[PDB]
């Protein structure tokens, strides 16, 4: 089997991408944030505290003839940005782009943190990291990809995120028309539960490539590119007037600037992020200070190849017995 679904930016900045997902019988379609940095499929629901729902579409398990309470199971998650959610668990039929999993754990939110409530466009998350990170207790549950893997034509999914435009998530096949050149594959460590890999270095604009190992994670659920402070300083030094602002929370730059590209290495291959992809717009409406899309990871504990980096590539998440990642230009 295969599946193919379009993923759409939630706003004009590509802050996140939503993909429609059919849950239950008859189908209830919710727009979920596919997140290769986490491993829970959780949704706003008829069980979510009413004051914490503000425009999201909800899953109502009582209206699904295939829903079954997973007795005794609870979940609770906290994300790198400080947001969180928790609740109970149903199993139900879940389909993405024509690919159907029966008995998928659908984690129904009883509580969500304010950042979720305040974003009416995201109805939940669909985690695509390794199932060892799934938070369901006392019986950990499998991700949608883990449940589908054995049925897929090939045990892979691909992320093809658009710049200011829709893109595609495919399951079970590699669309050879979706990229240019070849796909360069690179080793993955699953020891932390992430799609963790080592970039071979970077360049700023037309500058020389610096060969240096940068361990980080491929994370579709993170908006920006978070890298070591040395690398980030080297980038923003090429933008007149750019500076790190403690009060804003990162590097800002004059909105009148033209940003240089940023290149990252994948083995001997190179992925070029155009400068425009690094512009996240005014820090507040009407400001001439703009927020940068490359930020320091120093306060995180891990480097994160988020959407800013991934949208410059066609990315293969290869879930074979020994997982690997592939990157191609497009």
Curated annotation (Swiss-Prot):
Record-annotated disulphide pairs: 255-290
Documented EC number(s): 3.4.23.22
EC top class, as a word: hydrolase
Reactions this protein catalyses: Hydrolysis of proteins with specificity similar to that of pepsin A, prefers hydrophobic residues at P1 and P1', but does not cleave 14-Ala-|-Leu-15 in the B chain of insulin or Z-Glu-Tyr. Clots milk
GO MF annotations, alphabetized: aspartic-type endopeptidase activity
Domain (Peptidase A1) ranges: 17-328
Keywords, sorted A to Z: Aspartyl protease, Disulfide bond, Hydrolase, Protease, Signal, Zymogen
Name the record gives this protein: Endothiapepsin
Species assigned in the record: Cryphonectria parasitica (Chestnut blight fungus)
The encoding gene: EAPA
Residues of the full protein shown: 90 to 419 of 419
